[PDB]
Structure 1
């Protein structure tokens, strides 16, 4: 909004802003080293305690 001027200094025009807002696309990445000799017993089925 704007105040309508009372005097004849300048015409109290309307105001609208066209603003463009650029987004912040972030990438987060860790690692988790996991040993394959646990994967080998992951794939095997167990039968003994």
Structure 2
């Protein structure tokens, strides 16, 4: 909005602002390691100790 004045200033006629904001897209990557020599036995069933 604006403010009417008594004196004659160059009056601002209903200014309308449109701003936009973009997304700061950024990601996270972790690093797990696993050795495969014990991964064949997780799908199977145990019978020997």
TM-score computed with the length of structure 2 as normaliser:
0.70
Q: Structure 1 stretches of 5 or more lacking a match? A: none
Q: Structure 2 stretches of 5 or more lacking a match? A: none
User: What is the total number of aligned residue pairs between the two structures?
Assistant: 49
Q: Deviations over 1:20-42 (max 9, x none)?
A: 21111111101101111121111
Task: Indicate the RMSD between aligned Cα atoms, in angstroms.
Answer: 1.8
- Structure with greater proportional helix content: 1
Q: In the alignment, is the contact (CA less than 8 A) between 1:2 and 1:14 conserved in 2? A: yes
TM-score computed with the length of structure 1 as normaliser:
0.70
